[PDB]
Amino acid sequence: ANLLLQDPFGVLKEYPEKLTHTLEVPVAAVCVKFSPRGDYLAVGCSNGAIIIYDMDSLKPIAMLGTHSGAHTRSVQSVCWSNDGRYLWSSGRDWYAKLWDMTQPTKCFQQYKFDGPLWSCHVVRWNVCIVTVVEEPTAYVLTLTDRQNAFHCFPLLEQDQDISGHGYTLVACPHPTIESIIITGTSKGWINAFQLDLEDKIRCCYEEKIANANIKQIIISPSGTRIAINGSDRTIRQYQLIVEHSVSIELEHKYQDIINRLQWNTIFFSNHSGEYLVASAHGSSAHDLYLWETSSGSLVRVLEGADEELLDIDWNFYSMRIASNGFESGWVYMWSIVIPPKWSALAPDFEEVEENIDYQEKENEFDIEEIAIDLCTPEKYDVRGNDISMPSFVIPIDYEGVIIQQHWA
């Protein structure tokens, strides 16, 4: 990532504001999920496809589900491994297909569940937490050393009933602790179960925030702020403190005051969650919102699309916002759009915007052995990212490219 090192400066602004791309995907799509690096964009589809695009030319590199383990029903969620090599994908076919891009169209392993699925969230590339329909516990799917037995440990202490606290529907693993996973019931309580990765699970937090059907829980990537999306028209960002012993408090609430509408999806910025981005629900909701998570106010509104938007992904490496269409199925994409500069034409050019008063010097009327290294890749970019941990590039299907010229 060396464009931005000399792009030049003036690209750090922490959101994109112009929509630049539009994946004209005919088969409508629910969930979108970028690669961990800015390379690819997985597109969870309605008719059972999971299209995988290469983000550089807006056209796919494969559509997995040909050889083994096609999601027959609609797919609700897709996450990736920590590197970007595997892919867990939970659909409504009661399966949770873990893919391997090395053998692209062939699923690695799956598992039959108790019903359709809401989501999946990958903690280590094997273990994955999957939300079974209307079950008061989440069955963590740990892909063991043997590929046939995934111990679906109940994510619940043995006797703490949550009847009246609700039913587990979401679970987002904590980034900077990785052993606590916060899970959301359906009547406002939020259970916090710490995996030992034995199976003991301490209930580090059980508390009702409001008597609402929790739709979605997200964590900042520094684990500092946690926001909840109730079934009341409110977003509740908290302040998360854990060493274990965990504790939250109400920082701010977010609501549609005028239109008084529901929130579909919510997402946090890269570093510490200085920005929240939410998608409203009703008619005439044509635009994602932004929020200064400290001041609490609606900073900006990303007026791109034409009709409601469902899923939000924010890959900060590309600084992009993928946002699927609720109606058309098309996948709008915002992007920090740099303009060119003619100061790149010559090594002594300069682009000023004021008629500058050059002051006269005198002579307008008068007529290398330094430290050179080629071995270390750069450790950071202008966003402070974890570059130089080499991402899993896609293996282009070189078993089937040779026919791929002829008839797909």
Partner: protein
């Protein structure tokens, strides 16, 4: 006597877009009387609209359906956006 008008409040916006220009009084009486038209045109339509639905309050939701009716095309979308952005800042602070 004191006969109120929007003389200053138009001037304070002239100093925000074009901070070097001024305005002739005959073209201030126009702006004084342009806003008094758009006021009585928006609050008019936003009071047939709170009465067809048998409400008895002009909320801020009538004023944005009234603006999405009167103001055409791209003045609708912008004046909604600068509408909601200025009521959110009111409630929060």
């Amino acid at each position: 006597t004191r006969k109120e008008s929007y003389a200053i409040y138009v001037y304070k916006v002239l100093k925000q877009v074009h901070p070097d220009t001024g305005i002739s009084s005959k073209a201030m009486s126009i702006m004084n009387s342009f806003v008094n038209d758009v006021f009585e045109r928006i609050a008019g339509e936003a009071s047939r609209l709170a009465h067809y639905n048998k409400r008895s309050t002009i909320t801020s939701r009538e004023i944005q359906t009234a603006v999405r009716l009167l103001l055409p095309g791209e003045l609708a979308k912008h004046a909604v956006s600068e509408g909601t952005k200025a009521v959110t800042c009111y409630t929060s602070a």
